[PDB]
Amino acid sequence: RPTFYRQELNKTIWEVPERYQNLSPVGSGAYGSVCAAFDTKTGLRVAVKKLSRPFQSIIHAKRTYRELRLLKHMKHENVIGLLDVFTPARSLEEFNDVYLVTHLMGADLNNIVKLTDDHVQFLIYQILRGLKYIHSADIIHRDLKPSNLAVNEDCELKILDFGLTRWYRAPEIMLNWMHYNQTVDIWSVGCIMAELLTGRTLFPGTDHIDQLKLILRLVGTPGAELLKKISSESARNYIQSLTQMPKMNFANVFIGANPLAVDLLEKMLVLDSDKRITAAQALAHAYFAQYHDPDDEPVADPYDQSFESRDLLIDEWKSLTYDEVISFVPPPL
Numbered sequence: 001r002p003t004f005y006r007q008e009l010n011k012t013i014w015e016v017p018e019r020y021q022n023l024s025p026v027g028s029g030a031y032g033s034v035c036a037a038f039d040t041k042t043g044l045r046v047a048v049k050k051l052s053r054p055f056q057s058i059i060h061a062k063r064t065y066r067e068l069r070l071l072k073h074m075k076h077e078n079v080i081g082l083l084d085v086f087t088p089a090r091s092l093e094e095f096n097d098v099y100l101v102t103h104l105m106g107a108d109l110n111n112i113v114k115l116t117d118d119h120v121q122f123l124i125y126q127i128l129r130g131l132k133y134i135h136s137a138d139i140i141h142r143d144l145k146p147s148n149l150a151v152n153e154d155c156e157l158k159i160l161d162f163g164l165t166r167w168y169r170a171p172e173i174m175l176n177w178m179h180y181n182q183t184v185d186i187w188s189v190g191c192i193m194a195e196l197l198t199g200r201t202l203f204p205g206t207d208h209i210d211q212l213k214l215i216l217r218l219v220g221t222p223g224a225e226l227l228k229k230i231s232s233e234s235a236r237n238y239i240q241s242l243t244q245m246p247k248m249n250f251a252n253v254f255i256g257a258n259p260l261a262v263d264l265l266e267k268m269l270v271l272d273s274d275k276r277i278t279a280a281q282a283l284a285h286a287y288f289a290q291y292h293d294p295d296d297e298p299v300a301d302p303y304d305q306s307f308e309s310r311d312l313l314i315d316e317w318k319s320l321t322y323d324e325v326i327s328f329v330p331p332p333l
């Protein structure tokens with residue numbers, strides 16, 4: 001076992017192996033803070049995430065386990081991958097802290113697009129390619145948005161925070177539809193791509209109701225065929241007593257855009273999620289012919305999400321997470 005050194009960083013303590021040097025705060029999220037570090041074994045800059053209160057509750061404990069399991073499973077160029085996982089603890093009894101190490105990207109899409117058609121083409125292409133891979137493990141992201149997309153200087157992109165604002169969320173989510181298909185994520189890609197080409201948030205709702213009014217404005221109120229599929233009297237009545245809008249012409253909306261990007265946006269931003277282009281299909285659209293290679297667009301090994309339906313004790317989630325830490329086998333490059 002390596003030796004750790006301790007350090008106070010923004011009210012939080014950081015205890016990490018000595019192989020990781022020059023720790024400096026990049027920022028903090030909902031469930032952890034992330035530091036930039038140097039990795040003396042590789043000469044590379046890494047991202048080190050310390051989990052905040054990983055076992056505070058049963059849902060936190062299960063959330064901690066979930067993140068570790070997801071991260072150990074992803075082996076793809078366009079999805080965040082695990083370099084290292086460590087804890088300063090010598091035993092299970094000690095176990096109370098988790099640190100995760102990934103490649104340091106240097107920015108998120110928020111930071112870089114605030115683009116040119118070729119930039120957009122390349123970024124969306126890579127998003128779609130990582131999604132194809134995630135979707136193939138029967139994993140749904142559910143919160144794709146620019147702040148979840150890590151991009152470096154070479155314009156290479158990795159999807160972060162993937163599996164389980166409202167500006168990017170599919171309409172079937174803000175209505176709390178029971179279940180979702182994978183193409184909830186295609187909607188979000190539609191919204192991101194739109195923003196990249198225009199400079200503006202496609203649907204900047206003030207809330208879930210406003211948000212929805214903006215979507216139906218671009219896309220049109222659902223017709224009887226989509227209405228056939230809505231059980232909820234609540235949901236269905238609102239829509240039916242609503243101000244019937246027609247579907248706008250996208251050519252008009254996105255005046256100036258590559259028409260091949262206008263066409264893809266048209267196939268992504270369908271209200272009926274059964275009618276949305278999938279990630280596979282999108283990769284083969286004409287907009288991406290200069291990046292698209294069928295034989296370099298991989299799918300994932302089967303992902304066991306059975307733990308998700310299980311209701312266990314904190315100590316059980318904590319101990320499962322520990323097993324995951326200990327069995328971690330690094331990537332060779």
Ligand SMILES: O=C(Nc1cc(Nc2ccc3c(c2)CCc2ccc(OC[C@H](O)CO)cc2C3=O)ccc1F)c1ccccc1
Pocket residue numbers: 026034036047048049066067070071080100101102103104105106107108150159160161162163
């Ligand atoms: O993604 C899951 N877990 C997870 C997430 C992360 N998150 C990361 C990583 C890298 C980066 C960012 C966020 C943020 C964008 C960004 C901005 C500035 C920057 O450098 C600026 C500074 O000036 C350097 O010079 C670097 C980066 C960056 O590179 C890190 C480790 C993890 F483990 C997960 C997966 C599944 C389920 C739950 C969670």
Ligand SMILES: CCCCCCCCO[C@@H]1O[C@H](CO)[C@@H](O)[C@H](O)[C@H]1O
Pocket residue numbers: 171172175177179180181212222226229239271272273274
């Ligand atoms: C009010 C505007 C939003 C209504 C249209 C969103 C419906 C999305 O589409 C629906 O998604 C469901 C999964 O969530 C599928 O099971 C349905 O087959 C599909 O029609």
